[PDB]
Each structure stands twice: as C-alpha cells, then as structure tokens.
C-alpha cells in the first residue's frame, strides 16, 4: 500500500 | 536570491521529497506505474545523496519498473 513511502523515507538522502 | 539562499528552501524541498514519496507509492499502489515512476524519480533528484534510496527501489520495485525507473532517472 501507499505507507510503503514511510521505506523511501527512512532510506532517505 | 538564489534557490538555496533561504531558510525556507530547505523547508520546501523536504515537503516536496516526501509528497512526491508519497504521490508516487499510492500511484503504484493503484496500478499507475507511468506516473508512480515520475513522482518516485522527482523525490530522487532532489536528494542529494540517493543511494539507500535507489538501493531500496530496486528491492521494492517489480523489475520492469525499475527498468523505467532507470529511464526516467
């Protein structure tokens, strides 16, 4: 689902 | 000034990174992976160091779309 965004950020930059 | 120059620069760019984050996973989680791999390619060029991203993208992503993702990058 879209709270897959919460991996991405936690990769973040 | 300058892109950059501001306080409120960093602010907007954080909000951008996650929206995009954001708008991209609920696009691929509706079955839009054209414009999922648009905002998921935005978030990665504003982030200055994007490795664990891309790394963690081609780990979640089907690898057809990480191909177009590779496109788009």
New interface residues.
């Given amino acids: 689902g879209p709270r897959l965004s919460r991996l991405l950020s936690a990769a973040g930059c | 000034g300058p892109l950059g120059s501001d306080l409120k620069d960093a602010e907007a760019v954080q909000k951008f ?2 929206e995009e ?2 708008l ?3 696009l ?2 509706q079955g839009d992976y054209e414009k999922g791999v648009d905002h ?1 390619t935005n ?1 990665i060029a504003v ?4 490795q ?2 891309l ?3 081609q780990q ?1 992503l089907p690898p057809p779309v990480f191909q177009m993702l590779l496109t788009k990058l």
């Fill in positions: 990174f996650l984050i954001q991209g996973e609920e691929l989680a998921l978030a982030c200055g160091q994007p664990q991203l790394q963690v993208l979640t």
